[PDB]
């Protein structure tokens, strides 16, 4: 659809949007094009805050000048966009601002997606009221596998939706995020944005077809929030930088098995199935388990029910399901006394009961 961005905020106000990251428990890759277009995808994932905060944040502000100012705190970068030719220049070399550019474009600041036709960006945001100033914060080393890219895209889209009064619900935010992924030619799946924007634990399912709008079924969060099991979920930043159809059918069926185990509240089965998801991911691709990750895994595999890397991974973050709190203390001991990198450390993850949230000052 075409959008009509209208300044829905006061001139002395800032829109703050923020989203947790996402850990996929099972079914990942079945959401990734093109296999999702044949059998459909089943993905059990979950929204998590890191160290008690939503990691993916966006500030949107009115700007005195009649242009667009993109800033990045985690990279300390800045860029000025004043024409449609610059805004739609998504892969400007050296610009880490492809995501907010595409998001502003989808919000009606590009000629194709704006319902009202304008001639220049200056006139467009002069009728809009003033310029726009977007400041991003993604305090996560890239290549984490935590859905950072797509969830940050959804966060920018929701911040702009609140900033312009577009009245998008979370589902349409995720759908426009899929459109944005198609704009930047990332070819990415749809698991990440639904895992991050929507609160709690979810099973996501699609049918065959090019239209990939996932059906969402929430799961109880007992195995993640109850004090019996809460301290058994460990997330470890490792300091690492970065015929098949039968296997993907097996991955769909395994996502359904994980859904069953979570419904029934079986913690041991849940951990074993996380381990099986790790085995499936290793079977699918060669570069899933770099040698440093396996070196870490060998130190603590005897105290876990299962483990995996979030998303594509390739290193960085490692999710582990300890057998019990005593085993969790043992794992923290081992990985603190045998750090595979000086930057390796544990990250406290909590289930997000909020998902994407947005407020004003
Ligand atoms: C298993 C794979 O994980 C990716 O997540 P990231 O590693 O990019 O955070 C998703 O973008 C893919 O769609 C796929 O589900």
Residue numbers in the entry: 571 to 812, 831 to 949
The authors write:
The bifunctional l-fucokinase/GDP-β-l-fucose pyrophosphorylase (FKP) from Bacteroides fragilis catalyzes the conversion from l-fucose to GDP-β-l-fucose. The full-length FKP (FKP-FL, 949 amino acids) exists as a tetramer in solution, but the individually prepared N-terminal domain (FKP-NTD corresponding to the sequence 1–496, also containing a SUMO tag) and C-terminal domain (FKP-CTD, the sequence 519–949) form a monomer and a dimer, respectively. FKP-NTD has a single α/β domain and a β-helix-containing domain, whereas FKP-CTD folds into two α/β domains and the linker comprises three α-helices.
Initial trials with both FKP-FL and its selenomethionine (Se–Met) derivative yielded an orthorhombic crystal form, which, however, did not contain the FL protein. Instead, it turned out to have a single FKP-CTD-like molecule as the asymmetric unit, probably a result of proteolysis. Subsequent soaking of the native crystals with fucose-1-P allowed direct observation of the binding mode of the sugar–phosphate product in the kinase active site. The refined FKP-CTD–fucose-1-P model to 2.46 Å resolution contains amino acid residues 571 to 812 and 831 to 949. Fucose-1-P is bound between the two domains. The bound product fucose-1-P in the complex crystal of FKP-CTD revealed the binding mode of l-fucose (substrate) because the structure of the sugar moiety, including β-configured C1-OH, is virtually identical. In the crystal, all free hydroxyl groups of fucose-1-P are involved in direct interactions with the protein. C2-OH is hydrogen bonded to the side chain of Asp762, C3-OH to those of Asp601 and Thr602, and C4-OH to Asp601 and Gln761. The side-chain indole group of Trp599 lies parallel to the plane of C4–C5–C6 at distances of 3.5 to 4.0 Å, apparently engaged in strong van der Waals or stacking interactions with the sugar moiety. Interestingly, an analysis of the packing in the F222 crystal of FKP-CTD also shows the same tetrameric organization despite its appearance as dimers in solution.
